[model samples]
Target: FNDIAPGIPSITAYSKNGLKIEFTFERSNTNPSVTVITIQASNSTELDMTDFVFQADVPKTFQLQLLSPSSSVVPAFNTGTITQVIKVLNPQKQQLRMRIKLTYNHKGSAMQDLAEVNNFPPQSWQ
Candidate 1:
């Protein structure tokens, strides 16, 4: 099957009412599991997106999984004042693809989401 590997998944939490999360993924088949997740926290409303924080949780159902502190560093945490890059490392898996839990707040109500983060396609040199 030839699926058009989607470019960075969109932030569909609240359908990007105002603030949105734009992110990208980079991986190495040489060590695929240890992927790098980069995030761009932006605001399209009158409210400051930085006033709120964000935390993303990637699936850990694999043999080994861990998220190193990147932007958010708290229990079930809350905000991001800048663009961030967090590492989702799981070297043993060799192949990486799963759901990610994205959480954030605005307008005094909490919002949560489940997003699909797919495998980074292998790079071939012709």
Candidate 2:
């Protein structure tokens, strides 16, 4: 995994079709092994994105739980957005790496993409 300054809490994925997905990490106050990641998606094009879904995977030593998404549609031009949350449990306090997959529909055509997130701020799991 890559490193970032402790003050930086988020990382953004550069996806195709002018779509932006951001991942913001926050440590759990009650459980040191747990971290909450908020995922948000926004569009910059005129075409609306429908049936938007996010999937993620981590290493075998770590655990990942993906919560329900806020909505299935993302309005065009950043007029609206989609939000989701993922819970990561790192029992051994290891650096976190995640592989993400996104699927959506634009202008009645199916679209999908992948992202590899290897950088997470130290504040999230330290």
Candidate 3:
């Protein structure tokens, strides 16, 4: 029996003040696959892993639409893409840590998993 081998890529993010946030990750094979991407953020919180306080299971291919704290629509990713994006109303003034996980399925039956973690200063666009 042959096992399915899945490739994982590194995750990175770029943020601009009072604008948009972009998250990028590469796939080993660009074979018209589907990926389920999840993103979370943390700021000086020493809670349990389950109590870290974040969102989960956000799907993105070229872009992702996010909501603001005021229940307004935040234009996250508008590049007509399936990438990741997080819109912010205010620029955060602390260290921000982001975690992204990718689960991919291809050809109707093949599946793969991958993840990445990164830490950076707040309010600086990468």
Candidate 4:
């Protein structure tokens, strides 16, 4: 029980096209933990944040998963917001991490479901 706190995901784009990615979690609740959001993109040569899964347009590198009534877990209210419509090719020379998992059903509790990772450095493509 490390208490878990380290999901500070941020991606913002707005000129009228409107795009935002924000996942901030530090945990605090009575019954509101159902968050599973994952996003990953890598350069360099070695990067495996669990093989990063989730797709829609079949890009070269991508990952985004929001489960639990479509994310931002709101069963008893802990937090909210997880929107998508992306076209990121060079997301600030990319290396991003926004992994989170918080599920609750304490009868025999063994919590192990939440993730986040952001890493980026190395770019050359013309």
Candidate 5:
């Protein structure tokens, strides 16, 4: 039997107001016990996202860590983006799940939104 190989997988989520966030998952090359994911937020309009913040929650059996984001401001018209890194450890080899919360100021208004991610590739967990 021939088995399909798993490559780097990514997911894209958009808020109600059209702001977009992308999650790219990859196995940690330096550590087989961890999975590394990149969070890249993008904007496609004239409005800029200021004071951008990213937060997440996972199950009790898993451990998660976040690194400082690339920038607090996401430029407009897709000219630039905000990037962050996430490290996940699964000792029990459980399925990956996360609830992402994003907060920012756009067009002089404070905004908050969320997205649920549970579709990570199997290779990302083990």
Candidate 6:
């Protein structure tokens, strides 16, 4: 996978006041064993994945390692966003998802992961 770089197979969706998520497998021609995923919560806002409820259809070949996310926004806000530096042990090109509540502000809107407003509760106003 010479041309395989980060941001490959990036697929996402957006909402009014909910989360906007991009699940990508950062390219690594050196060693594909370990791949980095930028689970950026574009509130659109924002996690530090641990305390927050994180859900994903992780590839069987890979294992969830670490998720060090930036600060998030308040559940009552509609601006800003959250981001996470995700590391997977042994990874492949697959789809990642975020499933949680209050992470998004667009109620009555079907964007949970937005399946496509995803989750992540914020630190900075990016």
lDDT digits (tens) for residues 56-110 of candidate 1 = 4544654323333244422122234346666666645544555556565655557
TM agreement with the true structure for every prediction: 0.49, 0.88, 0.27, 0.20, 0.86, 0.48
Residue 114 CA displacement from its true place in model 1, Å: 5.8
Cα lDDT for residue 100, model 5? 84
Provide the lowest-lDDT 10-residue window in model 6. Answer: 117-126
Write model 2 residue lDDT over 5-106, tens digit each, in one string.
655477775556878888888888789899998888999999999899999998899999999999999889899878999999999998877888889999
Q: What is the C-alpha RMSD of each candidate to the true structure, in Å?
A: 7.6, 4.0, 18.0, 18.2, 2.8, 9.4
| Highest TM-score model number | 2
lDDT of each: 0.49, 0.85, 0.29, 0.28, 0.82, 0.45
Worst 10 residues of 3 by lDDT: 44-53
CA deviation > 4 Å runs, candidate 4? 1-91, 110-112, 117-126
lDDT of each residue in 1-126, candidate 5, tens digit only? 866446766767453565778878888778776888898888887988899999998889989999999999889888988999989988788888888888999999998877787567677786
Steric collisions counted per model? 4, 0, 8, 10, 0, 19
Candidate 6 local lDDT, 72-125, one digit each (tens)? 432324354466676655444344433323232243332333133243211110
Better candidate number, 3 or 6, judged by lDDT:
6
lDDT of 2 at 68: 98
- After superposition on all CA atoms, how large is the RMSD of candidate 5? 2.8
Off by over 4 Å in 3: 1-84, 88-92, 107-114, 119-126
Sort the candidates on TM-score, descending order.
2, 5, 1, 6, 3, 4
lDDT of 5: 0.82
Comparison by TM-score, 3 against 4, better one: 3
Q: Candidate 1: lDDT of 24?
A: 65
Sorted by lDDT (best first), the order is 2, 5, 1, 6, 3, 4
Q: The CA-based lDDT of model 2 is what?
A: 0.85
